[PDB]
Amino acid sequence: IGLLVDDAIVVVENVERVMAEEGLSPREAARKSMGQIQGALVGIAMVLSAVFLPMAFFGGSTGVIYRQFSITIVSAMALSVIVALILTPALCATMLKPIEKGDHGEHKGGFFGWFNRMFLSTTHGYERGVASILKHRAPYLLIYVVIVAGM
Amino acid sequence: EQGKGIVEAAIEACRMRLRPIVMTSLAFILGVVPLAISTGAGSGSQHAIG
């Protein structure tokens, strides 16, 4: 259910992202956004099914344990990419036609419009953070080797 | 492949994609903390994965 609700939330953010950054039409928003997401979403299927397929190939008493685990995962993730490519591009374009006026999280209803501004401050700090990673680039790669000594 | 290079592209990529990562992170954490906190029938096997 965790990986099954992952892809149910990674696909609505991509179609609201073009509504937020461009104000594009909410019908053609799916064709505009998921024209470059349909390849990635069908490509994550053959890696998320390949991290589970060979473990269901074992024999003996552990084979009956390892099968009906991996089968119950691949049956969930094999059709979720299909319903993510079929259903929700139509449903974001039919039962969701939002046109926001005026506010951008300032008023928001009440005073809870500070949380998205805090999120903006964290990503504004995060781009400076990855710039400070790309400052010298040697210690942040040499700490990776002392990480994998843990492995 | 459109207008940017190498170092500048990966910064704007994570600036675009920081919101879905923290979207799935809190959801996946809070969905699996019940079987990591709960006690009872089969909880000793739930705690081996949660």
Side-chain angles (χ1 to χ4, degrees), chain A residues 103-148:
Chain A
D103 66 320
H104 207 59
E106 293 93 7
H107 166 50
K108 192 258 187 203
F111 68 101
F112 277 156
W114 87 275
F115 175 70
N116 40 351
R117 296 200 308 270
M118 189 66 208
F119 185 69
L120 289 176
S121 61
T122 49
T123 186
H124 268 254
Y126 168 73
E127 50 180 5
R128 184 178 180 271
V130 309
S132 46
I133 307 304
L134 297 180
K135 189 258 304 174
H136 198 194
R137 313 161 309 115
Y140 299 111
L141 193 144
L142 265 295
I143 288 314
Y144 178 79
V145 175
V146 77
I147 282 190
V148 303

Side-chain angles (χ1 to χ4, degrees), chain A residues 56-75:
Chain A
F57 277 172
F58 288 167
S61 199
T62 182
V64 175
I65 300 284
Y66 278 168
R67 298 178 303 274
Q68 92 190 0
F69 282 167
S70 164
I71 287 294
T72 40
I73 312 303
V74 295
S75 161

